[PDB]
């Protein structure tokens, strides 16, 4: 637990990628249901969520050429959500728009470091590997299914003037009783329609997130249910199949419902290789980054890890000596952490370099190594 004085804005900056990159302010969004021909990055194996910051380091000449071509055009590439990545099977995905880039000379080879952000979900229609070896994807933009209020079709016109509204539990009781009154016209009561109300689910998830982060919901958390749902999904430490099932969801209400069901059910995080070795619990999860408790970071050899920060973790051995080289969190030294039983890499133990920092130590576990578990 304890208190924090680290400054949560530093991990989001990805300062380990060197000096200040060239930043882009323009935004390119394609119309819904429209088809686009987007290039696919060959070495990206992550299941990207819209709004999630993705850092990359590319040194292959083909990758650097493709990145230059994208920077010269719309700065958008396709990140395939692979169901079976060994055979490179992909049915869904998410676009990523490059918002920062930096090519570095005085270097052994031409290398480019990139910060992009997920934008639009999509369904993969066609995959064609070009003669260059790089592959293109003919892609259909998936639309955000926004459904109206469940009372809109069963609303009394005389009560239309009562639908605008000016101890939180009493406030929510009054909200439920006033917004879903006309539920007495249907076969279902008010408290059932509350289970499908965007704001009620958003407030329950806000409570569950207040359990994790001390940043107030006044500013950090978005108000739109779609953006809120994507922000929550970007920081949920779940396996790849559950994340794929969550990306397939098009309606924000279903997304929030599934997210709160996950937050209620899965309470332990075990080793994926062990399945029977508890590593941490939901209670030790804490947010050290503005993007939440879990964020995507890139390492010196090009691998992207979704790191979830926790205060404590058990059943882990520490390999090697601590190092500050290319550390994802400035001011902390990492130490490789393996499972006590199967020796699989679970994450790193980050220890503060200065004695005045808090927390003095924490754990960053990679999402690909964890498995959620219900007791």
């Amino acid at each position: 637990p304890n208190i924090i004085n680290f400054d949560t804005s530093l991990p989001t900056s990805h300062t380990y990628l060197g000096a200040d990159m060239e930043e882009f302010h323009g935004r390119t969004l394609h119309d819904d249901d429209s088809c686009q021909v987007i290039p696919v990055l060959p070495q990206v194996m992550m299941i990207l969520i819209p709004g999630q910051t993705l850092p990359l380091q590319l040194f292959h000449p083909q990758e650097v050429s493709m990145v230059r071509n994208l920077i010269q055009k719309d700065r958008t590439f396709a990140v395939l959500a692979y169901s079976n990545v060994q055979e490179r099977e992909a049915q869904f995905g998410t676009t990523a728009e490059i918002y920062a880039y930096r090519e570095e000379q005085d270097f052994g080879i031409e290398i480019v470091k990139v910060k992009a952000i997920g934008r639009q979900r999509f369904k993969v229609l066609e995959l064609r590997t070009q003669s260059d070896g790089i592959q293109q994807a003919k892609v259909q933009i998936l639309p955000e299914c926004v459904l109206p209020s469940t009372m809109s079709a069963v609303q009394l016109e005389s009560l239309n003037k009562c639908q605008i509204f000016p101890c939180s539990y009493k406030w929510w009781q009054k909200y439920q009783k006033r917004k879903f009154h006309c539920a007495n016209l249907t076969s279902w009561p008010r408290w059932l329609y509350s289970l499908y109300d965007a704001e009620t689910l958003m407030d329950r998830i806000k409570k569950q997130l207040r359990e994790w982060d001390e940043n107030l919901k006044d500013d950090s958390l978005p108000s739109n249910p779609i953006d809120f749902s994507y922000r929550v999904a970007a920081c949920l430490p779940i396996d790849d199949v559950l994340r794929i099932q969550l990306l397939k969801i098009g309606s924000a209400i279903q997304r929030l419902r599934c997210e709160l069901d996950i937050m209620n059910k899965c309470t332990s995080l075990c080793c994926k290789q062990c399945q029977e070795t508890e590593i941490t619990t939901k209670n030790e999860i804490f947010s050290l980054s503005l993007c939440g408790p879990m964020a995507a970071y890139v390492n010196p050899h090009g691998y992207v890890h979704e790191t979830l920060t926790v205060y404590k973790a058990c059943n882990l051995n520490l390999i090697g000596r601590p190092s500050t080289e290319h550390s994802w969190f400035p001011g902390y030294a990492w130490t490789v952490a393996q499972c006590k039983i199967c020796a699989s890499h679970i994450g790193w133990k980050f220890t503060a370099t200065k004695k005045d920092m808090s927390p003095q130590k924490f754990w960053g576990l990679t999402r690909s190594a964890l498995l959620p578990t219900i007791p």
Binding site: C145, V146, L147, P148, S149, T150, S152, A153, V154, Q155, L156, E157, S158, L159, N160, K161, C162, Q163, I164, P166, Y169, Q173, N184, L185, T186, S187, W188, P189, W191, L192, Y193, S194, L195, Y196, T200, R204, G250, S251, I253, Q254
Partner: protein, 803 residues
């Protein structure tokens, strides 16, 4: 691929709006009533109302206002539909032929815009200079009322006030001026804006913005000589006319929120006000300038959806929750202290929350028992075909579910009543109802922090055993505290010859968003007393229960469970199925099970008796609000979804690919125009081109019937529909395909797999030349069989004989 036929058996009885004016003649006083898709025109006589016209439109009437511009001899009628079809109509009668001609029409929907929370608002400027529409937030649509605007062209003006609650056109203004109540982070205020047609913009209003009540909801434009505007909230009634600011806070209106009004005197001296609890108050304006405001409780009527003053103290009260009324007001109060005397009552079946089919009287002749109304307007309705004879049994509390038990010759009905918190420690009912005036009553045994509050309403749920002959409330069993009953079934289980009443419940608490505790209670009714035979505790809400081949199929949140009835008269779990969704809707046919979610998440399972579990057959996830589901046959499933639509999904048993065998193909879409609440298998005609019979009850009291057809008959009736649409003049000139098209704000597709039975039945009313036009130049035998007018008359008569 679906081939279905849907037809209306009872037109909507709920009243959503009523106006008075001079529409048929300048000397006649006309009363116009809107019943969703129906428009009724009456002439106000000394005795009462003389019916002069009834028409049907291809839309849901959202705005209905009369207005008389300069030069017109009598009033015109402006009508806007739910699909944003606006029109201006005029009454025309020559001898006996009455025709509602269309003076103007057009679609006012914008390509971009979010529909407002307060819904559609339609106002007309007093001097008939323009029509104002409030459809989307931040935009005000203006339709200039010139003589050349037959297409009803309109332009939008930007609104800095994004959350407008109510708006009215003020009287006595040189320029058309609107006065509206809006809300901002500072609170609720009232503002005014002049509408410039030359600039097509807004100009500063006559008086500055005033800070009003936090619950200011209603705006009333006072006519001359008073002028100004009255703002009505939950606690205060204010009046603003430039320098004139008059606020009153009568406590008699603090009990309930006033939701409707109507002008009595043409100069605006007296007004009628109706609250949510059915109370009718009189607002008096004392006088060049306004002297004072006064509120007098006139009495109690039905829960008023709309009020209108006719003449000679006669007032029409249009109600959707209950029967409509014609009431008489008197100068002197009676013996109980109420100036209101009920003259006449008009049946209203809305809302229909549940229903069932019973052969009460003559065997073979079916009757329909429905749970209608809500609160003190709750009742049971017994409907049979003679057009339709309806018997009413008032309950004075809200009915929710119903089922029939033949062996005991009685009905089981789930009901709920509202009670206020007691001053000491408990709850007190607001009025005597069926649950409190039963010949016998009982309560449940057993198996809450921050208790009670200050006079806050609480729902008390009861099971009512009602005799099928006399309809006396034989028994009224009350459930536990904080217990909500959801499902009800009457059936025999296992080898037990007794027929039981099974009720599924849920424990609801304010701290729990989702119920984690519930009951399945098994009662037996015999010798005029209800006893609890069995009781099972489940870890969730029992949303639905179904008799499944001598077993009990229950839906406990996300789980579908099968119970067996033991010899010790206990419920034994046989098998479970854990789903990705919460099992809201449960239906069965043989060994097939249909599971449904509020967001159109459909699942089809099959019971494997040799293995003793459930096996997934198919599913379909398309997010859209639902309301009711039913199984048409082994392969077809009917449902009602968002925006008053019906749909039919189909499976392929044999099929070709196991990946395709697990998908339910959407084979039918239709725009009904009603919000269906209940589907049930049954028919009302004495026991053919049609196969099956599924009745459905809706919110506006409309009752419908759906049946299945063959491919040849479906194609023939589709061609007939196209021809009839080509020949029939629509009121407001609304396209039939546009009205029947599956309409949501996300998508709009043409209707498929459905035959509009009302359109086909309208073929018998047109003239013989129109019949020959339709049958002009028209595949069961394998080739091409010709068709004359008499053949189609016989076909349509045979199709009408099914309802």
């Amino acid at each position: 691929m679906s081939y279905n036929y849907v037809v209306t058996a009872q037109k909507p009885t709920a009243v959503n709006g009523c106006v008075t004016g001079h529409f048929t003649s300048a000397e006649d006083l006309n009363l116009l009533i809107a019943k969703n898709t129906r428009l009724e025109i009456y002439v106000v006589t000394a005795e009462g109302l003389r019916p002069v016209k009834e028409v049907g439109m291809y839309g849901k009437i959202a705005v209905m206002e009369l207005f008389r511009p300069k030069g017109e001899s009598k009033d015109l009628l402006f009508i806007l539909t739910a699909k944003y079809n606006a029109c201006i109509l005029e009454y025309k009668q020559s001898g006996e032929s009455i025709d509602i001609i269309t003076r103007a029409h057009g679609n006012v929907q914008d390509r971009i815009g979010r529909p407002s929370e307060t819904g559609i608002i339609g106002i007309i400027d007093p001097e008939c200079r323009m029509i104002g529409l409030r459809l989307y937030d931040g935009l005000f649509k203006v339709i200039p009322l010139d003589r050349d605007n037959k297409e009803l062209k309109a332009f939008n003006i930007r609104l800095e006030e994004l959350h407008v609650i109510d708006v009215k056109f003020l009287y006595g203004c040189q320029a058309p001026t609107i006065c509206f109540v809006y809300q901002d982070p500072q609170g609720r205020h009232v503002k005014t804006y002049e509408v410039s047609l030359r600039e097509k913009e807004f100009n500063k209003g006559p008086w500055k913005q005033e800070n009003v009540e936090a619950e200011a909801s209603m705006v009333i434009a006072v006519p001359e000589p008073f002028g100004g505007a009255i703002i009505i909230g939950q606690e205060s009634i204010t009046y603003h006319n430039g320098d004139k600011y008059l606020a009153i806070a009568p406590p008699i209106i603090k009990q309930s929120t006033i939701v409707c009004h109507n002008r009595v005197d043409p100069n605006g001296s007296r007004y009628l006000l109706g609250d949510m609890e059915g109370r009718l108050f009189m607002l008096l304006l004392e006088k060049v300038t306004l002297k004072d405001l006064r509120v007098e409780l006139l009495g109690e009527t039905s829960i008023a959806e709309c009020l209108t003053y006719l003449d000679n103290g006669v007032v029409f009260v249009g109600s959707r929750l209950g029967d409509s009324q014609l009431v008489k007001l008197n100068v002197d109060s009676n013996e109980q202290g109420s100036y209101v005397v009920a003259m006449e009552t008009f049946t209203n079946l809305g809302p229909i929350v549940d229903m069932c089919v019973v052969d009460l009287e003559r065997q073979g002749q079916g009757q329909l028992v429905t749970c209608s109304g809500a609160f003190k307007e709750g009742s049971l309705r017994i409907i049979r075909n003679g057009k339709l004879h309806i018997r009413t049994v008032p309950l004075y509390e809200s009915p929710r579910k119903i089922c029939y038990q033949e062996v005991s010759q009685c009905f089981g009905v789930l009901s709920s009543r509202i009670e206020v918190q007691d001053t000491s420690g408990g709850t007190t009912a607001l009025r005597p109802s069926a649950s409190t005036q039963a010949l016998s009553s009982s309560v449940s045994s057993s198996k809450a922090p921050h208790e009670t509050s200050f006079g806050e309403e609480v729902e008390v749920h009861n099971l009512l055993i009602i005799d099928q002959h006399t309809f006396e409330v034989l028994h009224a069993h009350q459930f536990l505290q904080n217990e909500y009953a959801l499902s009800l079934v009457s059936c025999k289980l296992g080898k037990d010859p007794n027929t039981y009443f099974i009720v599924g419940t849920a424990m609801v608490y304010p701290e729990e968003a989702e119920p984690k505790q519930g009951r399945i209670v098994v009662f037996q009714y015999s010798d005029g007393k209800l006893q609890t035979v069995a009781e099972k505790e489940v870890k969730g809400a029992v949303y639905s229960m179904v008799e499944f081949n001598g077993k009990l199929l229950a839906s406990i949140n996300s789980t579908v469970r099968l119970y067996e009835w033991t010899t010790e008269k206990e419920l034994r779990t046989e098998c479970n199925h854990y789903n990705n969704i919460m099992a809201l809707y449960l239906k069965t046919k043989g060994d097939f099970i249909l599971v449904g979610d509020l967001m159109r998440s459909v699942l089809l399972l099959a019971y494997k008796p040799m293995e003793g579990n459930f096996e997934e057959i198919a599913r379909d996830f398309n997010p859209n609000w639902m309301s009711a589901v039913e199984i048409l046959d082994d392969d077809n499933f009917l449902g009602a979804e968002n925006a008053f639509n019906l749909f039919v999904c189909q499976k392929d048993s044999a099929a070709t690919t196991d990946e395709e065998r697990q998908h339910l193909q959407e084979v039918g879409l239709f725009h009904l125009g009603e919000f269906v609440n209940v589907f049930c298998h049954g028919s009302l005609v004495m026991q053919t081109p049609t196969q099956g019979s599924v009745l459905f009850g809706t919110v506006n009291g409309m009752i419908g019937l759906v049946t299945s057809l063959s491919e040849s008959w479906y194609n023939l009736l589709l061609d007939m529909q196209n021809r009839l649409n080509k020949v029939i003049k629509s009121v407001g000139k609304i396209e039939h395909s546009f009205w029947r098209s599956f309409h949501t704000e996300r998508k709009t597709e043409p209707a498929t797999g459905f035959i509009d039975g009302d359109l086909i039945e309208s073929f018998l009313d047109i003239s013989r030349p129109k019949m020959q036009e339709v049958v002009a130049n028209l595949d069961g035998s394998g080739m091409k069989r010709e068709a004359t007018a008499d053949d189609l008359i016989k076909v349509v008569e045979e199709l009408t004989r099914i309802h």
